[PDB]
Amino acid sequence: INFNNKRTELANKIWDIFIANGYENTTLAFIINKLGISKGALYHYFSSKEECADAAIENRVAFFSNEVLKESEEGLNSIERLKKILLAGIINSPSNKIFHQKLMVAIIKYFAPIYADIISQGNEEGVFKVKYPLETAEIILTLSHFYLDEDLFKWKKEDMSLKLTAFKETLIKILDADEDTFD
Amino acid sequence: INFNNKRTELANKIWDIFIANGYENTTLAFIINKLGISKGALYHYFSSKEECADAAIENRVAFFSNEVLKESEEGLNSIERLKKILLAGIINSPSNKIFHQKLMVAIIKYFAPIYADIISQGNEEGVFKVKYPLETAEIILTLSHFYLDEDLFKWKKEDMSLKLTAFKETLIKILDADEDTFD
Ligand code: NA
Ligand code: NA
């Protein structure tokens, strides 16, 4: 109620600490020293380092997604809204890969309804023909955040151009959109 | 050369230890005690617990994928090969989620050429019309191993039926296959 305002202020600061310093190497002692708080002050809001990460991620993605909705120009068609939202954006140790995975999952879950809305708008305009708008939104986001992640798959830098092309091709098929939609 | 035969025999045994006991809670001391080997015997083949996991995963997936190729019936059409291969199959703490992620990534990388071959066969038969066979194979596997993973996304059990339906719909669009292909 009031506890929520304080917890998210800290989560925001923890985000900056995890990004700037890495998740694996950030200790609860480093966090509290950097924040200027005690162990007790931290344990009042979080039970673990994982919860600190989840709170940092939730608040960052909740913010980023809300700033996409407020920045959305009134009356834009679905094709332009899709193009605009696709261009949006905020060591590879096992724990650092978990922080990245958590972030991909949160982005997918927060952006899926926005993309679902765009897809539904396009079905109504007659530019797409998608049977399952929310599932298709989640499908697209999974491809953009897992398949196009070169660090996840250790994809070669010279192969990324073909993956983006293949991604656009897939988007066209899935949406039943015109072939020149993403040109 | 000869070192490889021994290393993969251990990797196979480590796999069983990680599955039966969980990755997070499996200590290097538990591994060596269960295997009947010394710390030195283990450090001769692996530098870390992560490398033990990667070796266990590589050898399991390399095996599983090779047993799919040997079990493949001679002269099956692409539609039946696809249906057959789709039915194939071997705590949620941060480290356990890494073991699972590593496994998903290895399955995708080992099975992609098999699915690419099936897709190419179908393009030749005239049952599919896919511009990028290997990228499309990787796209499909990403959806079956990330999007359909209810533990990754914490999807509701009652929503899984719609996700499978949406997955099949997507497969049909991506492959340019007939609508009754997966019935
Ligand atoms: Na859903
Ligand atoms: Na590739």
Nearest CA among B78, B88, B86, B73 for reference residue B178: B78
Q: What is the CA radius of gyration of chain B?
A: 19
Centre a 10 Å sphere on the Cβ of residue A120 and count the other Cβ atoms it contains. 16
CB of A122 closer than 8 Å to CB of A82? yes
State CA B96 to chain mean position distance. Answer: 16
Identity (one letter) of the amino acid at B12?
Answer: N
**Using alpha carbons only, what angle is made at residue A53 by residues A30 and A145, rounded to the nearest 5 degrees?**
130
Q: Which residues of A touch chain B, with CB atoms under 8 Å apart?
A: 50, 94-95, 97-98, 101, 105, 108-109, 131-132, 135-136, 138-139, 142-143, 146-147, 152-153, 162-163, 165-167, 169-170, 173-174, 176
Task: Give the whole-angstrom CA distance, residue A129 versus residue A136.
Answer: 11
B166 with A97: Cβ contact below 8 A: no
**Residue B135 alpha carbon to ligand 2 centre in Å:** 6
Residue count (chain B): 183
Q: Which two tokens stand for residue A116?
A: 């679902």
B142 with A139: Cβ contact below 8 A: no
**A contacts of B170 (beta carbons < 8 Å):** 136, 139, 174
Task: Give the whole-angstrom CA distance, residue B83 versus residue B182.
Answer: 7
Q: Which long-range contacts (CB under 8 A, 24 or more apart) does B114-123 make?
A: B114/B65, B114/B68, B114/B69, B114/B85, B115/B82, B115/B85, B115/B140, B115/B141, B118/B78, B118/B81, B118/B82, B118/B85, B119/B78, B119/B175, B121/B77, B121/B78, B121/B81, B122/B77, B122/B78, B122/B79, B122/B82, B122/B175, B122/B177
Instruction: Choose the mutation target among B49, B54, B95, B101 for the interface with A, i.e. most A CBs under 10 Å.
Output: B101
Helix (H, G, I), strand (E, B) or coil at B138: helix
> Whole domain around residue A109: which residue ranges?
1-183
What CATH number is attached to the domain comprising B156?
1.10.357.10
* E runs forming strands in B34-127: none
Q: Which two tokens stand for residue A110?
A: 């927060």
Which-ligand-closest: CA of A148? 2
Q: Which of B50, B131, B139 has the CB atom closest to A94's CB atom? A: B50
> For A107, which residue in chain B has the nearest alpha carbon?
B153
Instruction: Choose the mutation target among A93, A99, A132, A165 for the interface with B, i.e. most B CBs under 10 Å.
Output: A132
A165 with B98: Cβ contact below 8 A: no
Q: Which residues of B touch chain A, with CB atoms under 8 Å apart?
A: 50, 94-95, 97-98, 101, 105, 108-109, 131-132, 135-136, 138-139, 142-143, 146-147, 152-153, 162-163, 165-167, 169-170, 173-174, 176
A170 with B139: Cβ contact below 8 A: yes
Q: Which residue has the tokens 């020149």?
A: A180
**Determination technique for this entry:** X-ray
Query: Which residues, at least 6 apart from A170, have a Cβ–Cβ distance to it below 8 Å?
Result: A143, B136, B139, B174
Phi, psi of A12 (to 5 degrees): -60, -45
What is the number of domains present in chain B?
1
Which-ligand-closest: CA of A147? 2
Q: Which uninterrupted H or E stretch holds A92?
A: none
A28 to A37, A43, A48, A99: CA distances (angstroms) = 11, 10, 9, 15
* E runs forming strands in A140-181: none
Centre a 10 Å sphere on the Cβ of residue B36 and count the other Cβ atoms it contains. 8
Identity (one letter) of the amino acid at A150?
Answer: E
